[PDB]
């Protein structure tokens, strides 16, 4: 059992809303993996001074090769020195089209499946809304321009419109009645049954959550889910550079630039696999076009304003449209919110005047205003919404430079032992 120093530095960059891999390391069953990443994160030069900080999220997952390669892997390992070589997957014939999984597309335009499948699995088990279509892309070449290079899009920071109730949420439960009578005992079960359905719809869409519900547990191997080993996050701040020449004097450019550590406590790697670490930069969804729900309603009813408890706990959800939340709110986008939820949270305010001011990372256009009457598309972060405020994405929206200190104890003959025959 000896130390293998896999420390290495990395220079990266990506688009706002998209999730990018920043460092992946292959591990072996028996490995004791430790990772201390430290460095600084920045964003392409801004147009004006600094407005608000971006929330940066770093993740480190562990994925058994078995999760990727399936039973085909168990054999690979079982057959040992005979095993049918594991198949690789395909990327498009472009260098960058492998980015989402932290690597340049190799000479042969094909990268190892575990990189690709892991990225998916990670995305489907933690980043997409449980109700959104599960990402299934077979190969890195079924991926489109933006995705393959920048990573999949993730959800905006949770707020009233970005974190609604799953669209298929029941708004009424019908129960069969005879013609002149009703089974009150049936009506009973009816409700109970509804309950089980809601419990699920609301927060138990994933198998594990259902089991946990009974007060049980589930190995990560049960539903084949990446293992979240470590998750840190922080706010990216910086400074303004002052203009000093005849015409620039009195102008300011914001240079976001935050240092940070992302430490992963010693971890025991039970089976051969990959340790993937990804980042995700986002800006809180501030919009000069959003207003308090109550300022929007035209006919203010008791059931709205009053905030009568008796009601708030027994009414069904409420279907409202983005129109109800933004002046330019797309009306075709319907979201189901919880009653009087506008009394459980206050929205951020931006004087309209910032509306057309190039340079602030605000949503100067009602969310999903150019994706169509599609909710999911509105909820996921459209990185173009930001092209506006950057002086020049020569390094995309953001970028970072960090040193990844990695120490791994493992059964490994010494290089000498490898090169020496006798």
């Amino acid at each position: 059992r000896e130390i293998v120093d896999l420390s290495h530095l990395a220079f990266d960059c990506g688009m706002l809303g998209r999730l990018k891999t920043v460092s992946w390391t292959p591990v072996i069953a028996g490995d004791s993996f430790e990772l201390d990443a430290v460095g600084a994160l920045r964003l392409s030069p801004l147009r004006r001074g600094l407005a608000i900080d971006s929330k940066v999220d770093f993740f480190t997952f562990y994925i058994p090769h078995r999760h990727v390669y399936g039973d085909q892997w168990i054999q690979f390992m079982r057959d040992g020195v005979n095993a049918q070589p594991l198949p690789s997957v395909t990327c498009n014939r472009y260098p960058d089209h492998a980015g989402y999984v932290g690597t340049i597309v190799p000479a042969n335009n094909r990268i190892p499946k575990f990189l690709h499948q892991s990225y998916l699995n990670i995305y489907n088990n933690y980043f997409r809304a449980p109700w959104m279509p599960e990402r299934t892309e077979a190969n890195p070449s079924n991926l489109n321009e933006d995705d393959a290079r920048y990573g999949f899009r993730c959800c905006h920071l949770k707020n009233i419109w970005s974190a609604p109730l799953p669209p298929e949420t029941k708004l009424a439960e019908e129960m069969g009645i005879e013609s002149n009578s009703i089974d009150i005992m049936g009506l009973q079960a009816a409700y109970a049954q509804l309950h089980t359905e809601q419990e699920r719809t609301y927060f138990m869409q994933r198998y594990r959550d259902v089991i946990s519900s009974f007060g049980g547990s589930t190995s990560y191997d049960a539903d084949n889910r990446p293992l979240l080993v470590m998750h840190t996050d922080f706010w990216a701040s910086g400074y303004d550079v002052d203009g000093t020449d005849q015409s620039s004097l009195g102008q300011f450019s914001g240079r976001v630039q935050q240092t940070f550590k992302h430490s992963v406590p010693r971890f025991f790697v039970p089976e051969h696999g990959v340790m993937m670490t990804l980042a995700l930069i986002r800006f809180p969804p501030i919009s000069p076009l959003e207003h308090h729900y109550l300022a929007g309603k035209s006919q203010l009813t008791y059931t709205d304003l009053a905030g009568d408890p008796a009601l708030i706990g027994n009414l069904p959800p409420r279907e409202i449209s983005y129109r109800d939340l933004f002046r330019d709110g797309r009306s075709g986008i319907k979201i189901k919110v919880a009653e009087s939820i506008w009394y459980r949270t206050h929205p951020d305010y931006v004087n309209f005047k910032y509306h057309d001011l190039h340079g602030f990372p605000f949503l100067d256009d009602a969310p999903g205003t150019s994706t169509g009457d599609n909710l999911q598309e509105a909820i996921l972060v459209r990185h173009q919404d930001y092209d506006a405020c950057f002086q020049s994405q020569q390094l995309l929206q953001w970028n970072k430079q960090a040193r990844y200190n990695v120490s791994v104890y493992r059964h490994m003959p010494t290089v000498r032992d490898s090169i020496m025959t006798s």
């Binding site: 130390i3 120093d5 420390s7 290495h8 530095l9 920045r42 240092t259 550590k261 040193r403 290089v415």
Partner: peptide, 26 residues
């Protein structure tokens, strides 16, 4: 979140030997 003002990265530098090349090479 770490306070400090951004520092440039240094060396990619441990266990036993890795590079056998015939003798000493700087």
């Amino acid at each position: 979140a770490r306070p400090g003002r951004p520092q440039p990265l240094r060396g990619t530098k441990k266990g036993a030997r890795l590079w056998y090349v015939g003798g000493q090479q700087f």
